[PDB]
């Protein structure tokens, strides 16, 4: 089997991407944030505290003929941005892009933090990191990908995120029309439950490539590119007037600037992030200070190749017995 679904930016900045997901019988379609940095499939639901729902579409298990309470199971998750959610668990039929899993754990939110309530465009998350991170207790649950794997034509999924445009998540096949050149594969460590890999270095603009190992994670659920302070300083030093602002919470730059590209290494291959991908616009409405898309990972404890980086590539998440990541230009 295979599946193929379109993923759409939630706003003009590509702050996140939503993908429609069918849950239950008859189908209830929710728009979920596919997150390769977590391992829970959770939804706004009929159980969510009413004051914490503001425009989201909810899953109502009592309207699904295939929903079953997973008795005694609870979940609770905290993300890198300080957001959180928790609740109970149902099993139900879940389909993505024509690919169906029966018996998928669908984590029903009873509580969500303010950042979720305030984002009316995201109806929940679909985790695509390794199932070792799943938070369901007392019986840990599998991700949609792990449950689909054995049925797929190839044990892979691919992320093809758009810049200010829709893109695609494919499951079970590699669309050889969706990228240019060849795919470079690189080793993954699953020790922390992430798609963790080591970049071979970077360049700023037209500058020389610096060969240096940068361990980090491929995380579709993180907007920006978070790298070591040395790398980030080297980037922003090439933008007149850029500075790190403790008041704003990272590097800002004059909105009049033209940003340089950023290149990262994948083995001997190179992925170029155009400068315009690194512009996240005014820090507040009407400001002439703009927020940067490359930020320091210091104090986060891991480097994160988030959407800024991943949307410059066609990315293969190879879930074979020995997992690997692949990157191609596009």
Q: Which residue has the tokens 């080793």?
A: 187
| Residue 114 appears among annotated catalytic residues | no
- Of the listed 14, 33, 35, 146, which one is catalytic? 35
Asked if residues 164 and 307 have their Cβ atoms less than 8 Å apart, the reply is no
| Residue 64 appears among annotated catalytic residues | no
- Of the listed 45, 108, 131, 199, which one is catalytic? 199
Q: Cα–Cα distance between 141 and 155 in angstroms, integer?
A: 19
C-alpha distances out from residue 19 to 34, 209, 259, Å: 7, 36, 30
Q: Cα–Cα distance between 299 and 82 in angstroms, integer?
A: 13
CB neighbour list of residue 16: distance below 8 Å, 6 or more residues apart: 9, 10, 33, 119, 121, 122, 221, 223, 307
Question: Which alpha helices (H) appear in the chain, and where do they start and end?
Answer: 114-118, 144-148, 229-236, 307-310
**Residues designated catalytic:** 35, 199
């Amino acid at each position: 089997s295979t599946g193929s679904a379109t993923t759409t930016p939630i706003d003009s900045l590509d702050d996140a991407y939503i993908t429609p997901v069918q849950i239950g019988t008859p189908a209830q379609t929710l728009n979920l944030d596919f997150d390769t940095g977590s391992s829970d499939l959770w939804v706004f639901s009929s159980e969510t505290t009413a004051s914490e729902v503001d425009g989201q579409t909810i899953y109502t298990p009592s309207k699904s003929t295939t929903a079953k309470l997973l008795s005694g199971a609870t979940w609770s998750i905290s993300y890198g941005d300080g957001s959180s959610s928790s609740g109970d668990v149902y099993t139900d039929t879940v389909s993505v892009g024509g690919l169906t899993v029966t018996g998928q754990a669908v984590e029903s939110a009873k509580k969500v933090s303010s950042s979720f309530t305030e984002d009316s465009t995201i109806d929940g998350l679909l985790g695509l990191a390794f199932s070792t991170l799943n938070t369901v207790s007392p019986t840990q649950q599998k991700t949609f990908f792990d449950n689909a794997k054995a049925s797929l034509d190839s044990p892979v999924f691919t992320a093809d995120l758009g810049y200010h445009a829709p893109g695609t998540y494919n499951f079970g096949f590699i669309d050889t029309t969706a990228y240019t050149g060849s795919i470079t594969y690189t080793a993954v460590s699953t020790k922390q439950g992430f798609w963790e890999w080591t970049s071979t270095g970077y360049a700023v603009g037209s500058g020389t490539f610096k060969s240096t190992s940068i361990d980090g994670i491929a995380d579709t659920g993180t907007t920006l590119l978070y790298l070591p302070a040395t790398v980030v300083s080297a980037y922003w030093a090439q933008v007149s007037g850029a500075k790190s602002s403790s008041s704003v919470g990272g590097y800002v730059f004059p909105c009049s600037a033209t940003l340089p590209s950023f290149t990262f290494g994948v083995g001997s291959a190179r992925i170029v992030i155009p400068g315009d991908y690194i512009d996240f616009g005014p820090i507040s409405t009407g400001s002439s200070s703009c927020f940067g898309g490359i930020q320091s990972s210091a104090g986060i404890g891991i480097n994160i190749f988030g959407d800024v980086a991943l949307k410059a590539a066609f990315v293969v998440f190879n879930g074979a017995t020995t997992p690997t990541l692949g990157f191609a230009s596009k």
